[PDB]
């Protein structure tokens, strides 16, 4: 009963980033930020480079960072199992569309949540939901620890497994804040009545996780990548509009006849394929609106700018972006792995190099091949390579 | 208790480099120096070459200098063991993004520190923090040894495992100063009340380390790479804005009509696709604003300047940079290796050349292959190669 005003005060500062995200989405991807009942169209606009570029970038990161085909001493078989059941459990949760939607949100808006619901009778799979920016709220301290999370869900009445439907389109809030020592108090509220029982949970077992693309110090919410090149995108839009408008204006036809033409237009017009008109050469001049134009050097600037944007968006990650790969290998891969393990219940090149280098004493002369100390030779070789080989005899 | 005024004095000393760093970040990467409550955007402005170039350089140095895949006679195996352990300690500490952020500061701001937090249950990983230049304070002697270190941190009330909450958003200071023999006093204070106990530590046990890009003689703060080419960046920005403004001016059309035209615009406009207008060809020009311009040779100078900046940024480290690798040889891997080992608690080419050289006496005739003493031959070839081979018999 004390939840909604916290959501309001969080939205009070969420509003600025929401407005910025809406403005940036209008330029590149209009249909991502569409509030319920808004329906702010989805037309791409004058320039199409931004939409295709961001789609390609998000998809490329989704494929490389999360390969679909592959997963991302006596206990080796046990580890192989654990990984296999973990991957099978994730594949049953249908997370890849959620991953690509999240990547799109980070590129366009900058923040979104991945929420994993508990298994339910109506939806046994319980797929991961990509909650967009406007439908949650996060309160973060100066250091960067996530103090408060509030998630808003709008669900139908006949959507809950237990007899809660008996006790009662309904919107509910899930509020989680940790009191300290890695312990989060979580609570559920339905409109005004606090439903369920508040739970004390380890941070690992948190039923949702937060992605931020690009966070500055002392900022509660992140920033998108398109924010960094809005200016270039606007320049591309302006130049594309100019060139298209010039082409259309020149495409029009208007005709012209000189006054005192000494010829009659009706006879010139109201017939076809030949006939005798007895007129003047200079009459009927075929003018067009934009005969002269200057759209020649415009294309050079337009192609320069679009080429620069494509170079930015990789139309090569470790050498181009790199930091995104490492950052998401920590902030995103690790929570996914933890979820995978909890739902259920570099060096070989050294071996290859050692094999290549140790094959040498084979063609040596017999008097030279002999009088060699095996164990210490191999131990020195593996020490120089610095490889953990429990293989050879002592 | 007597901490804050020293921090104020050191901040007064730092203000000059802080202002220079903010001005430099305005050119390329605005968001690096973002104090809480500033939020000075992240626009590239007129030109975006500098931001992309510095991102690429910082990322590539982070990748090469700290390879992600790999680590950066009888007892040798044991050594290997501990090495892996150290890397494991670094893998559970999530240091790579901190390294990337530190390189970004070094390229733009030029100084920062890496701080290792004490293990706590609120954040059990305890990631290394990349504290920027403006939060901390450093005072050094004329020789260059670190005299005084001040750290400012801000956390919520429920972020301390011990009874610090019982004794009472809070900001705290950490002071570090030695009296000699590598004996450092470290103290913690909260606003006015000194908390904890003044701890005496060795130099190695210090939980933070300082980064400098180039430090000059008698200087308390380093200088960034962007300092040397801020002028070139400004020139590129000027030429880019000139080109963009010229293109925008040329894009606009203005239209014209000659006085005494003998034709009327009202009938010339309010229709389309054909018509006869009874006008004059000499009328109606489509003039545009920047018809003539001289922007063609500007592109040449812009390309030369951007190519020079790219070559300097070398978008070959041993060949081009060289000094950075040598400096970080002592600056980073030594302290990071010490950290990794303490958390827990060249020559083979000579062998290949030797094997190649001793292969020769296998095709010599019987009267020639013999009559050579093997042990002295082995010792002599080893000595001429000047290697330590524990293989051959005495």
CSV table of N, CA, C and O in Angstrom, one decimal, chain A residues 204-302:
chain,number,residue,atom,x,y,z
A,204,UNK,N,21.7,-13.7,-5.7
A,204,UNK,CA,21.8,-14.6,-6.8
A,204,UNK,C,20.5,-15.1,-7.2
A,204,UNK,O,20.2,-15.2,-8.5
A,205,UNK,N,19.5,-15.4,-6.3
A,205,UNK,CA,18.2,-15.9,-6.6
A,205,UNK,C,17.2,-14.8,-7.0
A,205,UNK,O,16.0,-15.0,-7.0
A,206,UNK,N,17.7,-13.6,-7.4
A,206,UNK,CA,16.9,-12.5,-7.8
A,206,UNK,C,16.1,-12.9,-9.1
A,206,UNK,O,16.8,-13.3,-10.0
A,207,UNK,N,14.8,-12.7,-9.1
A,207,UNK,CA,14.1,-13.2,-10.3
A,207,UNK,C,14.1,-12.3,-11.5
A,207,UNK,O,13.4,-12.4,-12.5
A,208,UNK,N,15.0,-11.3,-11.5
A,208,UNK,CA,15.2,-10.4,-12.6
A,208,UNK,C,16.6,-9.8,-12.6
A,208,UNK,O,17.3,-9.9,-11.6
A,209,UNK,N,17.0,-9.3,-13.8
A,209,UNK,CA,18.4,-8.8,-14.0
A,209,UNK,C,18.3,-7.6,-14.9
A,209,UNK,O,17.4,-7.5,-15.7
A,210,UNK,N,19.3,-6.7,-14.7
A,210,UNK,CA,19.3,-5.4,-15.3
A,210,UNK,C,20.5,-5.2,-16.3
A,210,UNK,O,21.6,-5.6,-15.9
A,211,UNK,N,20.2,-4.7,-17.5
A,211,UNK,CA,21.2,-4.4,-18.5
A,211,UNK,C,21.3,-2.9,-18.7
A,211,UNK,O,20.2,-2.3,-18.9
A,212,UNK,N,22.5,-2.4,-18.7
A,212,UNK,CA,22.7,-1.0,-19.0
A,212,UNK,C,23.8,-1.0,-20.1
A,212,UNK,O,24.9,-1.6,-19.9
A,213,UNK,N,23.6,-0.2,-21.2
A,213,UNK,CA,24.5,-0.2,-22.3
A,213,UNK,C,25.8,0.6,-21.9
A,213,UNK,O,26.9,0.2,-22.2
A,214,UNK,N,25.6,1.8,-21.3
A,214,UNK,CA,26.6,2.8,-21.2
A,214,UNK,C,26.2,3.8,-20.1
A,214,UNK,O,25.4,4.6,-20.3
A,215,UNK,N,26.9,3.6,-19.0
A,215,UNK,CA,26.6,4.4,-17.7
A,215,UNK,C,27.8,5.3,-17.4
A,215,UNK,O,28.9,4.9,-17.4
A,216,UNK,N,27.4,6.6,-17.1
A,216,UNK,CA,28.3,7.5,-16.6
A,216,UNK,C,28.3,7.5,-15.1
A,216,UNK,O,27.4,6.9,-14.5
A,217,UNK,N,29.4,8.0,-14.4
A,217,UNK,CA,29.4,8.0,-13.0
A,217,UNK,C,28.3,8.9,-12.4
A,217,UNK,O,28.0,9.9,-12.9
A,218,UNK,N,27.8,8.4,-11.3
A,218,UNK,CA,26.7,9.1,-10.7
A,218,UNK,C,25.4,9.2,-11.4
A,218,UNK,O,24.6,10.1,-11.2
A,219,UNK,N,25.2,8.3,-12.4
A,219,UNK,CA,24.0,8.3,-13.2
A,219,UNK,C,23.2,7.0,-12.9
A,219,UNK,O,23.7,5.9,-12.8
A,220,UNK,N,21.9,7.2,-12.6
A,220,UNK,CA,21.0,6.1,-12.3
A,220,UNK,C,20.7,5.2,-13.5
A,220,UNK,O,20.4,4.0,-13.4
A,221,UNK,N,20.7,5.8,-14.7
A,221,UNK,CA,20.4,5.1,-15.9
A,221,UNK,C,21.5,5.4,-16.9
A,221,UNK,O,22.2,6.3,-16.9
A,222,UNK,N,21.6,4.4,-17.9
A,222,UNK,CA,22.6,4.5,-18.9
A,222,UNK,C,22.2,5.4,-20.0
A,222,UNK,O,21.2,6.1,-20.0
A,223,UNK,N,23.1,5.4,-21.1
A,223,UNK,CA,22.9,6.1,-22.3
A,223,UNK,C,23.0,5.2,-23.5
A,223,UNK,O,23.8,4.2,-23.4
A,224,UNK,N,22.4,5.5,-24.6
A,224,UNK,CA,22.5,4.7,-25.8
A,224,UNK,C,23.6,5.1,-26.7
A,224,UNK,O,24.3,6.1,-26.5
A,225,UNK,N,23.9,4.2,-27.6
A,225,UNK,CA,25.0,4.4,-28.6
A,225,UNK,C,24.6,5.5,-29.6
A,225,UNK,O,25.4,6.3,-30.0
A,226,UNK,N,23.3,5.4,-30.1
A,226,UNK,CA,22.9,6.4,-31.1
A,226,UNK,C,22.8,7.8,-30.5
A,226,UNK,O,22.8,8.7,-31.3
A,227,UNK,N,22.9,7.9,-29.2
A,227,UNK,CA,23.0,9.2,-28.6
A,227,UNK,C,24.4,9.9,-29.0
A,227,UNK,O,24.5,11.1,-29.1
A,228,UNK,N,25.4,9.0,-29.3
A,228,UNK,CA,26.7,9.5,-29.6
A,228,UNK,C,26.8,10.0,-31.1
A,228,UNK,O,27.7,10.8,-31.4
A,229,UNK,N,25.9,9.6,-31.9
A,229,UNK,CA,26.0,10.0,-33.3
A,229,UNK,C,24.6,10.5,-33.9
A,229,UNK,O,24.4,10.5,-35.1
A,230,UNK,N,23.8,11.0,-32.9
A,230,UNK,CA,22.6,11.7,-33.4
A,230,UNK,C,22.9,12.8,-34.3
A,230,UNK,O,22.1,13.1,-35.3
A,231,UNK,N,23.9,13.6,-34.1
A,231,UNK,CA,24.3,14.7,-35.0
A,231,UNK,C,24.5,14.2,-36.4
A,231,UNK,O,24.0,14.8,-37.4
A,232,UNK,N,25.4,13.2,-36.5
A,232,UNK,CA,25.6,12.7,-37.9
A,232,UNK,C,24.4,12.1,-38.5
A,232,UNK,O,24.2,12.3,-39.7
A,233,UNK,N,23.5,11.4,-37.7
A,233,UNK,CA,22.3,10.9,-38.3
A,233,UNK,C,21.4,12.0,-38.8
A,233,UNK,O,20.7,11.9,-39.8
A,234,UNK,N,21.3,13.1,-38.0
A,234,UNK,CA,20.5,14.3,-38.4
A,234,UNK,C,21.1,14.9,-39.7
A,234,UNK,O,20.3,15.3,-40.6
A,235,UNK,N,22.4,15.0,-39.8
A,235,UNK,CA,23.0,15.5,-41.0
A,235,UNK,C,22.6,14.6,-42.2
A,235,UNK,O,22.3,15.1,-43.3
A,236,UNK,N,22.7,13.3,-42.0
A,236,UNK,CA,22.3,12.4,-43.1
A,236,UNK,C,20.9,12.6,-43.5
A,236,UNK,O,20.5,12.6,-44.7
A,237,UNK,N,20.0,12.7,-42.5
A,237,UNK,CA,18.6,12.9,-42.8
A,237,UNK,C,18.3,14.2,-43.6
A,237,UNK,O,17.6,14.2,-44.5
A,238,UNK,N,19.0,15.3,-43.2
A,238,UNK,CA,18.8,16.5,-43.8
A,238,UNK,C,19.3,16.5,-45.3
A,238,UNK,O,18.6,16.9,-46.2
A,239,UNK,N,20.5,15.9,-45.5
A,239,UNK,CA,21.0,15.8,-46.9
A,239,UNK,C,20.2,14.9,-47.7
A,239,UNK,O,19.9,15.1,-48.9
A,240,UNK,N,19.7,13.7,-47.2
A,240,UNK,CA,18.8,12.8,-47.9
A,240,UNK,C,17.5,13.5,-48.3
A,240,UNK,O,17.0,13.4,-49.4
A,241,UNK,N,16.9,14.3,-47.4
A,241,UNK,CA,15.7,15.0,-47.7
A,241,UNK,C,16.0,16.0,-48.8
A,241,UNK,O,15.2,16.2,-49.7
A,242,UNK,N,17.1,16.8,-48.7
A,242,UNK,CA,17.4,17.8,-49.7
A,242,UNK,C,17.6,17.1,-51.1
A,242,UNK,O,17.0,17.6,-52.1
A,243,UNK,N,18.3,16.0,-51.2
A,243,UNK,CA,18.5,15.4,-52.5
A,243,UNK,C,17.2,14.8,-53.1
A,243,UNK,O,17.0,14.9,-54.3
A,244,UNK,N,16.4,14.2,-52.2
A,244,UNK,CA,15.2,13.6,-52.7
A,244,UNK,C,14.2,14.7,-53.1
A,244,UNK,O,13.6,14.6,-54.2
A,245,UNK,N,14.1,15.8,-52.4
A,245,UNK,CA,13.3,16.9,-52.8
A,245,UNK,C,13.7,17.5,-54.1
A,245,UNK,O,12.9,17.9,-54.9
A,246,UNK,N,15.0,17.7,-54.2
A,246,UNK,CA,15.6,18.2,-55.5
A,246,UNK,C,15.2,17.3,-56.7
A,246,UNK,O,14.8,17.8,-57.7
A,247,UNK,N,15.4,16.0,-56.5
A,247,UNK,CA,15.1,15.1,-57.6
A,247,UNK,C,13.6,15.2,-57.9
A,247,UNK,O,13.3,15.2,-59.1
A,248,UNK,N,12.7,15.2,-56.9
A,248,UNK,CA,11.3,15.2,-57.2
A,248,UNK,C,10.9,16.5,-57.9
A,248,UNK,O,10.1,16.6,-58.8
A,249,UNK,N,11.5,17.7,-57.4
A,249,UNK,CA,11.2,19.0,-58.0
A,249,UNK,C,11.7,19.1,-59.4
A,249,UNK,O,11.0,19.7,-60.3
A,250,UNK,N,12.8,18.5,-59.7
A,250,UNK,CA,13.3,18.5,-61.1
A,250,UNK,C,12.5,17.5,-62.0
A,250,UNK,O,12.4,17.7,-63.2
A,251,UNK,N,11.9,16.4,-61.4
A,251,UNK,CA,11.1,15.5,-62.2
A,251,UNK,C,9.9,16.1,-62.7
A,251,UNK,O,9.3,15.5,-63.7
A,252,UNK,N,9.4,17.2,-62.2
A,252,UNK,CA,8.1,17.7,-62.6
A,252,UNK,C,8.3,18.4,-64.0
A,252,UNK,O,9.4,18.8,-64.4
A,253,UNK,N,7.2,18.5,-64.7
A,253,UNK,CA,7.1,19.1,-66.1
A,253,UNK,C,6.1,20.2,-66.1
A,253,UNK,O,5.0,20.1,-65.4
A,254,UNK,N,6.4,21.4,-66.7
A,254,UNK,CA,5.5,22.5,-66.7
A,254,UNK,C,5.2,23.1,-68.0
A,254,UNK,O,4.2,23.8,-68.2
A,255,UNK,N,6.2,22.9,-69.0
A,255,UNK,CA,6.0,23.5,-70.4
A,255,UNK,C,6.0,25.0,-70.4
A,255,UNK,O,6.0,25.7,-69.3
A,256,UNK,N,6.1,25.6,-71.6
A,256,UNK,CA,6.1,27.1,-71.7
A,256,UNK,C,6.0,27.4,-73.2
A,256,UNK,O,6.6,26.7,-74.0
A,257,UNK,N,5.2,28.5,-73.5
A,257,UNK,CA,5.2,29.0,-74.8
A,257,UNK,C,5.4,30.5,-74.8
A,257,UNK,O,5.0,31.2,-73.8
A,258,UNK,N,6.2,31.0,-75.8
A,258,UNK,CA,6.5,32.5,-75.8
A,258,UNK,C,5.3,33.3,-76.2
A,258,UNK,O,4.5,32.8,-77.1
A,259,UNK,N,5.0,34.4,-75.6
A,259,UNK,CA,3.9,35.2,-76.0
A,259,UNK,C,4.1,35.7,-77.5
A,259,UNK,O,5.2,35.9,-77.9
A,260,UNK,N,2.9,35.9,-78.2
A,260,UNK,CA,3.0,36.2,-79.6
A,260,UNK,C,3.6,35.0,-80.3
A,260,UNK,O,4.4,35.2,-81.2
A,261,UNK,N,3.1,33.8,-80.0
A,261,UNK,CA,3.7,32.5,-80.5
A,261,UNK,C,3.6,32.3,-82.0
A,261,UNK,O,4.3,31.5,-82.6
A,262,UNK,N,2.6,33.0,-82.6
A,262,UNK,CA,2.3,32.9,-84.1
A,262,UNK,C,1.9,31.5,-84.4
A,262,UNK,O,1.7,31.1,-85.5
A,263,UNK,N,1.6,30.7,-83.3
A,263,UNK,CA,1.0,29.3,-83.4
A,263,UNK,C,-0.1,29.2,-82.5
A,263,UNK,O,-0.2,29.9,-81.5
A,264,UNK,N,-1.0,28.2,-82.7
A,264,UNK,CA,-2.2,27.9,-81.9
A,264,UNK,C,-2.0,26.6,-81.2
A,264,UNK,O,-1.7,25.6,-81.8
A,265,UNK,N,-2.2,26.7,-79.9
A,265,UNK,CA,-1.9,25.6,-79.0
A,265,UNK,C,-2.9,24.4,-79.2
A,265,UNK,O,-2.5,23.2,-79.0
A,266,UNK,N,-4.1,24.7,-79.4
A,266,UNK,CA,-5.1,23.6,-79.5
A,266,UNK,C,-4.8,22.6,-80.6
A,266,UNK,O,-4.9,21.4,-80.4
A,267,UNK,N,-4.4,23.2,-81.8
A,267,UNK,CA,-4.1,22.3,-82.9
A,267,UNK,C,-2.8,21.5,-82.6
A,267,UNK,O,-2.6,20.4,-83.0
A,268,UNK,N,-1.8,22.2,-81.9
A,268,UNK,CA,-0.6,21.5,-81.5
A,268,UNK,C,-0.8,20.4,-80.5
A,268,UNK,O,-0.1,19.4,-80.4
A,269,UNK,N,-1.9,20.5,-79.7
A,269,UNK,CA,-2.1,19.6,-78.6
A,269,UNK,C,-3.2,18.5,-79.0
A,269,UNK,O,-3.0,17.3,-78.8
A,270,UNK,N,-4.3,18.9,-79.5
A,270,UNK,CA,-5.4,18.0,-79.7
A,270,UNK,C,-5.3,17.2,-81.0
A,270,UNK,O,-6.1,17.1,-81.9
A,271,UNK,N,-4.1,16.5,-81.1
A,271,UNK,CA,-3.8,15.6,-82.1
A,271,UNK,C,-2.6,14.8,-81.7
A,271,UNK,O,-2.0,15.1,-80.6
A,272,UNK,N,-2.1,13.9,-82.5
A,272,UNK,CA,-0.9,13.1,-82.2
A,272,UNK,C,-0.3,12.3,-83.3
A,272,UNK,O,-1.0,11.9,-84.2
A,273,UNK,N,1.0,12.0,-83.2
A,273,UNK,CA,1.7,11.3,-84.2
A,273,UNK,C,1.7,11.9,-85.5
A,273,UNK,O,1.2,11.4,-86.5
A,274,UNK,N,2.2,13.1,-85.6
A,274,UNK,CA,2.4,13.8,-86.9
A,274,UNK,C,1.7,15.1,-87.0
A,274,UNK,O,1.7,16.0,-86.2
A,275,UNK,N,0.9,15.2,-88.1
A,275,UNK,CA,0.1,16.3,-88.5
A,275,UNK,C,0.9,17.6,-88.7
A,275,UNK,O,2.1,17.7,-88.4
A,276,UNK,N,0.2,18.6,-89.3
A,276,UNK,CA,0.8,19.9,-89.7
A,276,UNK,C,0.3,20.9,-88.8
A,276,UNK,O,-0.9,21.1,-88.6
A,277,UNK,N,1.3,21.7,-88.2
A,277,UNK,CA,0.9,22.7,-87.2
A,277,UNK,C,1.3,24.1,-87.6
A,277,UNK,O,0.6,25.0,-87.2
A,278,UNK,N,2.3,24.3,-88.4
A,278,UNK,CA,2.7,25.6,-88.9
A,278,UNK,C,3.0,26.6,-87.7
A,278,UNK,O,2.3,27.6,-87.5
A,279,UNK,N,4.0,26.2,-86.9
A,279,UNK,CA,4.3,27.0,-85.7
A,279,UNK,C,5.7,27.5,-85.7
A,279,UNK,O,6.3,27.8,-86.8
A,280,UNK,N,6.3,27.7,-84.5
A,280,UNK,CA,7.6,28.3,-84.4
A,280,UNK,C,8.5,27.3,-83.5
A,280,UNK,O,8.0,26.6,-82.7
A,281,UNK,N,9.8,27.4,-83.8
A,281,UNK,CA,10.7,26.5,-83.1
A,281,UNK,C,10.7,26.7,-81.6
A,281,UNK,O,10.6,25.8,-80.8
A,282,UNK,N,10.8,28.0,-81.2
A,282,UNK,CA,11.1,28.3,-79.8
A,282,UNK,C,9.9,28.0,-78.9
A,282,UNK,O,10.0,28.0,-77.7
A,283,UNK,N,8.7,27.8,-79.5
A,283,UNK,CA,7.5,27.6,-78.8
A,283,UNK,C,7.5,26.1,-78.2
A,283,UNK,O,8.1,25.2,-78.9
A,284,UNK,N,6.8,25.9,-77.1
A,284,UNK,CA,6.8,24.6,-76.4
A,284,UNK,C,8.2,24.3,-76.0
A,284,UNK,O,8.9,23.6,-76.8
A,285,UNK,N,8.7,24.8,-74.9
A,285,UNK,CA,10.1,24.8,-74.6
A,285,UNK,C,10.5,23.7,-73.6
A,285,UNK,O,11.7,23.4,-73.5
A,286,UNK,N,9.5,23.1,-72.9
A,286,UNK,CA,9.8,22.0,-72.0
A,286,UNK,C,10.7,22.5,-70.9
A,286,UNK,O,11.9,22.3,-71.0
A,287,UNK,N,10.2,23.0,-69.8
A,287,UNK,CA,11.0,23.8,-68.9
A,287,UNK,C,11.5,22.9,-67.7
A,287,UNK,O,12.7,22.9,-67.4
A,288,UNK,N,10.5,22.3,-67.0
A,288,UNK,CA,10.8,21.6,-65.7
A,288,UNK,C,11.1,22.6,-64.6
A,288,UNK,O,11.6,23.7,-64.9
A,289,UNK,N,10.8,22.3,-63.4
A,289,UNK,CA,11.0,23.2,-62.3
A,289,UNK,C,12.5,23.4,-61.9
A,289,UNK,O,13.0,24.5,-61.7
A,290,UNK,N,13.2,22.3,-61.9
A,290,UNK,CA,14.6,22.3,-61.4
A,290,UNK,C,15.6,21.9,-62.4
A,290,UNK,O,16.6,21.1,-62.1
A,291,UNK,N,15.5,22.5,-63.6
A,291,UNK,CA,16.4,22.1,-64.7
A,291,UNK,C,17.9,22.2,-64.3
A,291,UNK,O,18.7,21.4,-64.7
A,292,UNK,N,18.3,23.3,-63.6
A,292,UNK,CA,19.7,23.6,-63.3
A,292,UNK,C,20.2,22.7,-62.2
A,292,UNK,O,21.1,21.9,-62.4
A,293,UNK,N,19.7,22.9,-61.0
A,293,UNK,CA,20.0,22.2,-59.8
A,293,UNK,C,21.5,22.3,-59.4
A,293,UNK,O,22.3,22.8,-60.2
A,294,UNK,N,21.9,21.8,-58.2
A,294,UNK,CA,23.3,21.7,-57.8
A,294,UNK,C,23.5,20.5,-57.0
A,294,UNK,O,24.4,20.5,-56.1
A,295,UNK,N,22.8,19.4,-57.2
A,295,UNK,CA,22.8,18.2,-56.4
A,295,UNK,C,24.1,17.3,-56.7
A,295,UNK,O,24.1,16.2,-56.2
A,296,UNK,N,25.1,17.8,-57.4
A,296,UNK,CA,26.2,17.0,-57.8
A,296,UNK,C,27.1,16.8,-56.6
A,296,UNK,O,27.4,15.6,-56.2
A,297,UNK,N,27.6,17.9,-55.9
A,297,UNK,CA,28.6,17.6,-54.8
A,297,UNK,C,27.9,17.2,-53.5
A,297,UNK,O,28.6,16.9,-52.5
A,298,UNK,N,26.5,17.3,-53.4
A,298,UNK,CA,25.8,16.9,-52.2
A,298,UNK,C,26.0,15.4,-52.0
A,298,UNK,O,26.2,15.0,-50.8
A,299,UNK,N,26.0,14.6,-53.1
A,299,UNK,CA,26.2,13.2,-52.9
A,299,UNK,C,27.5,12.8,-52.3
A,299,UNK,O,27.6,11.8,-51.6
A,300,UNK,N,28.6,13.6,-52.6
A,300,UNK,CA,29.9,13.3,-52.0
A,300,UNK,C,29.8,13.4,-50.4
A,300,UNK,O,30.3,12.5,-49.7
A,301,UNK,N,29.2,14.5,-49.9
A,301,UNK,CA,29.1,14.7,-48.5
A,301,UNK,C,28.2,13.6,-47.9
A,301,UNK,O,28.5,13.0,-46.8
A,302,UNK,N,27.1,13.3,-48.6
A,302,UNK,CA,26.2,12.2,-48.1
A,302,UNK,C,26.9,10.9,-48.0
A,302,UNK,O,26.8,10.2,-47.0
